[PDB]
Amino acid sequence: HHWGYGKHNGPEHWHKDFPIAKGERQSPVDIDTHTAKYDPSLKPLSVSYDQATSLRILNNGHAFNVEFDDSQDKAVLKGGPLDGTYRLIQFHFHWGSLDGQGSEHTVDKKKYAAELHLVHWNTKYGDFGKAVQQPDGLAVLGIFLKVGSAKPGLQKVVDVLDSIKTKGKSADFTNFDPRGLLPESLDYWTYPGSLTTPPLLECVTWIVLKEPISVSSEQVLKFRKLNFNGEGEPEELMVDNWRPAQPLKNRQIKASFK
Ligand SMILES: N=C(N)NC(=N)NCCc1ccc(S(N)(=O)=O)cc1
Ligand SMILES: N=C(N)NC(=N)NCCc1ccc(S(N)(=O)=O)cc1
Ligand SMILES: [Zn+2]
């Protein structure tokens, strides 16, 4: 009886094995745009992905992760609210059964069809496992997806998904350029939070871009053909793998833009 995205093991149950689920810095949150304060001290984000080395794509039973070589400073996030250098380790998405839900963060209670998380760890802690134990260990760049025009830079991802349909399946996934998943603007909101899946550790500086990317209906339909289950097991479509918004508590959401 492991955690997941069902009625009997979904987000409202997670606290039983992971009590931090009820903590003071949980993610995601609703971003209330009128109250988020413009902070002129925030810097432009520096996204430096020119040397990114993707390696593999994995269906982990909860999402699919595109994994990177993080053994050197190649694909790094700097600037913005961050001190120091954060290396890209993986990206994944959360998405819905329908276009009207799927994102983790919400904007004035609006849910997007999906949300991309580019996960980075602070090099001062040496490895990801050490970084998740620190309040400034991770930086997750969150990007909303809306359904409209296709995103050309997502299609390579879409087209490999049939080969990793079920939990535990992986495939080669070299030479993928994550710059193709960004929007035009790097304007963002930021706040201190957590991982949005167990173990729910409170180690994340969240950076959520304001501008969504557009993907096609056909692209997101292919996400929804993935399975939570393993091969040969009863098919459970991998949909609605999002945690809903958690209480903000006293936390300030800051905007990089006026
Ligand atoms: N830097 C190193 N030499 N070593 C290292 N362990 N690198 C991280 C490799 C890794 C692990 C898990 C994921 S996943 N499946 O969680 O996305 C993505 C990438
Ligand atoms: N648990 C697994 N099977 N795999 C995994 N690679 N998770 C690693 C830890 C993690 C990273 C980013 C987020 S988030 N959703 O906050 O960006 C949540 C959790
Ligand atoms: Zn995520």
From Swiss-Prot:
It catalyses: hydrogencarbonate + H(+) = CO2 + H2O; urea = cyanamide + H2O. Changing residue 60 to L: Reduced activity. SUPFAM superfamilies: Carbonic anhydrase (SSF51069). The record marks 5, 60, 65 as: Fine-tunes the proton-transfer properties of H-64. Changing residue 196 to A/C/H/P: Strongly reduced activity. The modification Phosphoserine is found at residues 163, 170. Changing residue 195 to E/H/R: Strongly reduced CO(2) hydrase activity. Changing residue 119 to K/R: Strongly reduced CO(2) hydrase and p-nitrophenyl acetate esterase activities. This is Carbonic anhydrase 2. It comes from Homo sapiens. The gene is CA2.
